[PDB]
């Protein structure tokens, strides 16, 4: 079993990769009435926990690794992109 290589927190494959003070996330986490400490954390809309795979094809979209645990079923916040 592998899902990824951070020990930032967790890591996750996101479909959209935007940070949170972007006209993007800003837009999307005022539709989860997300509240923000630091709005300048990247959040990863629909971003599933990668632990499938553990090969190159374990992210279809973007690979991210989040350092906060509080998701809203599809996003993720304070994300960090990772590869390889």
């Given at each position: ?47 599933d926990?990668?632990?499938?795979a ?31």
């Amino acid at each position: 079993g592998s899902w990824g290589q951070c020990s930032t927190g967790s890591i996750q494959c996101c479909q959209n990769v935007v940070p949170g003070d972007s006209d993007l996330g800003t837009l999307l986490l005022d539709e989860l009435g997300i509240v923000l400490e630091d709005p300048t954390v990247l959040i990863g809309d629909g971003c599933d926990p990668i632990t499938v795979a553990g090969s190159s094809d374990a992210c279809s979209a973007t690979a991210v690794c989040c350092s906060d645990n509080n998701v809203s079923g599809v996003i993720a916040i304070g994300c960090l992109p990772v590869t390889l």
